[PDB]
């Protein structure tokens, strides 16, 4: 494949895009408020993914009608999640103005693959 790379740490160079910022989540807050601060900062970027998902979905089936179903029918279909996740995701949906069904779909993407 490739020779094992030497002298790559501390990170620098073309394979190091940048450092990751730190955020504090205070579990003493109710689940509905924990992600408020972080989601305010990152709501725009998360919307970029959703918009890109709509464009790709449009190919197989019109994205609008698909997203109505996800937003309207998926939350009721899956039912409630155990705490704190149900309230944590509900809070993330409110702050970001992203429907709950899409926030849920994002959070169970592993099972969805």
């Amino acid at each position: 494949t490739e020779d094992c790379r030497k002298s790559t740490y501390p990170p620098s160079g073309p394979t190091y895009r940048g450092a990751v910022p730190w955020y504090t989540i205070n579990l003493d807050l109710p689940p509905y408020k924990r992600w408020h601060e972080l989601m305010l900062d990152k709501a725009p970027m998360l919307k970029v993914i959703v918009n890109s998902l709509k464009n790709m979905i449009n190919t197989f089936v019109p994205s609008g009608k698909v997203m109505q179903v996800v937003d309207e029918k998926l939350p009721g279909l899956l039912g409630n999640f155990p705490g704190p996740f149900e309230e944590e995701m509900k809070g993330i949906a409110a702050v970001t103005d992203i429907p709950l069904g899409e926030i849920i779909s994002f959070n169970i993407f592993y099972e969805l693959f």
Binding site: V20, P21, W22, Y23, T24, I25, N26, L27, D28, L38, K42, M45, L46, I49
Partner: peptide
């Protein structure tokens, strides 16, 4: 979107 999280 990647972030480091300090759960306290």
């Amino acid at each position: 979107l990647t972030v480091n999280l300090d759960f306290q």
